Design a protein around this ligand. Structure first.
Ligand SMILES: Cc1cc2nc3c(=O)[nH]c(=O)nc-3n(C[C@H](O)[C@H](O)[C@H](O)COP(=O)(O)OP(=O)(O)OCC3O[C@@H](n4cnc5c(N)ncnc54)[C@H](O)[C@@H]3O)c2cc1C
Ligand SMILES: Cc1cc2nc3c(=O)[nH]c(=O)nc-3n(C[C@H](O)[C@H](O)[C@H](O)COP(=O)(O)OP(=O)(O)OCC3O[C@@H](n4cnc5c(N)ncnc54)[C@H](O)[C@@H]3O)c2cc1C
Ligand SMILES: O=C(O)[C@@H]1C[C@@H](O)CN1
Ligand SMILES: O=C(O)[C@@H]1C[C@@H](O)CN1
Lengths: 468, 468
């Protein structure tokens, strides 16, 4: 392997104490920057939590819950009485006074919960809904739902769906280009049957020509085409595919190839070193989506079953946060080689990147990204005019496109993401968690754990090594 | 009295059968127009009811509620099971498996429920919030809360608050003018102590100079100034004040004087005849807000206590709807004399006015109006570009300004309006009421009642004449 590819391989499952300790100083925000990040994060989070005065109203209730020492079901009774009294029109009057059921249930629960996350049933419908936010400075990436093709027929249908989508998105883009215009994202697992266990030779013979074909088509329309990151044991083959793609003569001088990297992997910073070298060698600017990672629960389960030396992902959420910040700095350092796209719904992460990107933002420096149904509220504070009290930073919304028949896997990942006690979007909804705790700096949090536990980067107490 | 003033007086409490029968043909929409009104009303109402697919989702539930014959608490249990199952990360695993308390309570209930209806605590705060919707084509009228001044000191404080508000609104308007720019609305009951029983001479000596002063100030800034309509026994004195105001030399050639008329009053069409004559004589275009009326519950109570010959308002809601349509046609007929401002949250009423206004709309022909916290959803379909799927008709939002100390009366009127089974905004939320019933034409509804009951315009069966 090349020097950079070899380094990736060696970092695959390196001990967490080692991995985290190495990231810490790369992730640490300079005192000035950290303060500004905190203030901005606090502000974003406060505005989000207090949208319709939710907190102000809460304070009003408790202010009476004590003046009468009433229970929850008590204060409510009083409000009910007060409401009835306020409905008296005249003040004087007021004053004076089998398995199919289970299978169907899961299917329906999936669809009801999934609606919030899906932009459209078809690409035409999705694209029709774009103007509203695009006119506000938002951008879109269309995510054709459906993954892990099991059969040759399945993969072919996905291929056809991508091609049609590119034509549609490309026509809608109308030459807006890879930055301001919409793009598409693809899953390699959709393009090859049984990708999960597919061998190198067959992937190169069969998947690659499909990847190349879609990419050439995207280039014809000048839209971004992003390669999604999936399970960790497919990282290596995805890099091999990316490597080959970047050297296609027909793509020379075109910077629309995108690639996701997952900060929850120990390999992430090493993947970045490789990508930097690849952009240099292939003479392009890569569009890189930095995400934390959507498959954590499965990654942990998988590793515990394979009984290997360790995990390919961190076991404490705060370590993934630290990894993201360290990786963000690396990406921001090389604007000639990478267009960083910072996917996050986390107010601290957003504010940290905003400060790390430095003075003198220009549109092509970077963008934020979010998932439809999750990020719009946060980014409505971010994308738009400074005069309107926004940050004037672009956000690209990932917009799922598909019917109920393709929704399951995506929906499950969203449930895990939204339901996890560790998730920012879960904690922001816990009004008992103080804002300062919510937007706490991850590097400092890691150092606090280190002082308490006796060393930096210990694994989660409840997630022992697979061999234990 | 003049011919027009005399006609108003004679119509004060005319029998409902007579009043309604007289309105019917003036209100009747030409077959073509009625159909277009129905289609548009249905569309507006459907989009409002189905915002986040509320109905589509409802249909999905019942589709299973029968396939298993499950109770409400039953289907819910299944969804709960399905949700837990969908939280299993790996599919294989899933598959295999005293009076102060009362006074305080009323105060707090008032404030919690009132927030949705109040734009700002102060005029500066209110004005700061205007750009968002103004940029979308909305307009504002600021409603300084506080009415029915009891003391001289009270009225003076209201007067000062209005003056300060005009300066603020006028500065914010910045010469946008009476149509495109914000205006203010005032209550005569705020400007004179014990207005409810005030005599003509004292009102002319004391209230009028205040009204004149505010109006001259509004003219200096070229903003609209609207006289609110209050209880029915103050209609006459309000007309006397308006009459005098319209002939002030300093207001000559200025068309910013506004006046509300209430369609629920039997006098409404006669007031319009008077206003038409007044605009002609005083050589101005009057800004007229046609509203249905906010004091119905109190009007009925008042009449039943005074034991008079009849009611000054209709006793069936559908009659008020008919009155509004008849009155709207009268206003639209005289664009040189009146700028009609159609206040309503009712999709049928809106659609009917839209069609009645005819072909070749121009911005200065008319506007719609709504209350903050009630009308924005409906009018988001209306104000804005045709290309964006809107109707391109302006709506002016009435924006209450004030603290909790001035909120009570306004809030109570909003509770009655929102809570009434007869209110459009209440019925649209009743998903068991078919859309077609919701947007049913009021003239046809009245004719249906007439055929069933044996004559047109009978009073509400539950609201006998006061002397009964
Ligand atoms: C536009 C877009 C494209 C995306 N593409 C991909 C993609 O191709 N592949 C993909 O994998 N994800 C992808 N993601 C999504 C992504 O990974 C999740 O949305 C993300 O991890 C949420 O991070 P956050 O900063 O919003 O929330 P945060 O609440 O701050 O962090 C959330 C998360 O931390 C991690 N985590 C949770 N618990 C632990 C733990 N105990 N130990 C270590 N880490 C933990 C997870 O990665 C997790 O999702 C994409 C997201 C967006 C917005
Ligand atoms: C910008 C603005 C300014 C306003 N200014 C004033 C004002 O100065 N004075 C004022 O009085 N109102 C004023 N109103 C408000 C107003 O009168 C109510 O908002 C209104 O009546 C609601 O009508 P609607 O078409 O939205 O609802 P709809 O549901 O179609 O009709 C509602 C109503 O019909 C009436 N009604 C209810 N029951 C009966 C019945 N049994 N018999 C007869 N009629 C019945 C009422 O007038 C009532 O509010 C204003 C409203 C707005 C938007
Ligand atoms: O599948 C997922 O969970 C993420 C989100 C999308 O952008 C696609 N990759
Ligand atoms: O007081 C009311 O109820 C109405 C609404 C405002 O426009 C003022 N008049």
């Amino acid at each position: 392997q090349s020097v950079s590819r070899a380094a990736i391989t060696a970092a695959y499952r390196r001990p967490e104490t080692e991995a985290v300790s190495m990231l810490l100083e790369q992730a640490r925000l300079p005192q000035p920057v950290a303060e500004q990040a905190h203030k901005l994060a606090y502000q974003l989070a406060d505005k989000l939590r207090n949208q319709k005065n939710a907190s102000g109203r809460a304070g009003m209730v408790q202010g009476l819950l004590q003046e009468f020492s009433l229970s929850s079901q008590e204060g409510v009774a009083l409000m009910c009485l007060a409401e009835a009294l306020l409905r008296i029109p005249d003040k004087a009057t007021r004053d004076a006074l089998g398995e199919p059921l289970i299978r169907k249930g899961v299917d329906m629960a999936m669809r009801l919960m999934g609606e919030q996350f899906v932009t459209g049933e078809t690409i035409a419908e999705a694209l029709a809904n774009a103007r509203k936010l695009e006119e506000k400075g938002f951008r879109y990436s269309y995510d054709m739902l459906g993954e892990a093709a099991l059969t040759a027929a399945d993969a072919q249908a996905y291929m056809v769906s991508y091609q049609q989508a590119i034509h549609a998105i490309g026509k809608a883009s109308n030459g807006r280009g890879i930055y301001e215009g919409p793009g598409i994202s693809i899953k390699l697992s959709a393009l090859h049957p049984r990708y999960s266990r597919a061998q190198y030779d067959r992937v190169m013979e069969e998947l690659y020509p499909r990847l190349k074909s879609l990419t050439l088509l995207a280039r014809q329309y000048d839209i971004g085409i992003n390669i999604d990151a999936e399970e960790s044991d497919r990282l290596e083959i995805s890099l091999d595919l990316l490597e080959k793609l970047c050297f296609e003569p027909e793509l020379a001088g075109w910077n629309g190839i995108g690639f996701v990297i997952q900060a929850y992997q120990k390999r992430c910073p090493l993947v970045i070193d490789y990508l930097i070298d690849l952009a240099t060698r292939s003479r392009r600017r890569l569009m890189i989506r930095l995400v934390k990672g959507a498959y954590w629960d499965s990654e942990i389960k998988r590793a515990q079953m394979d009984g290997l030396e360790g995990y390919p992902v961190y076991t404490r959420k705060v370590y993934t946060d630290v990894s993201y910040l360290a990786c963000a700095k690396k990406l921001l350092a090389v604007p000639n080689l990478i267009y960083p796209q910072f996917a996050t719904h986390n107010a601290h992460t957003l504010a940290a990147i905003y400060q790390l990107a430095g003075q003198n933002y220009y549109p092509g420096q970077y963008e934020f990204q979010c998932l439809h149904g999750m990020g719009e509220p946060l980014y409505e504070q971010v994308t738009g005019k400074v005069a309107d009290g926004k940050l004037n930073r672009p956000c690209r919304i990932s917009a799922p496109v598909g019917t109920h028949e393709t929704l399951l896997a995506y929906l499950v990942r969203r449930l895990l993401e939204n339901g996890a006690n560790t998730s920012f979007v879960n904690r922001i909804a816990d009004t008992s968690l103080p804002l300062d705790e919510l937007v706490a700096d991850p590097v400092t949090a890691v150092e606090k754990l280190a002082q308490q536990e006796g060393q930096t980067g210990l694994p989660h107490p409840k997630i022992p090594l697979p061999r234990d």
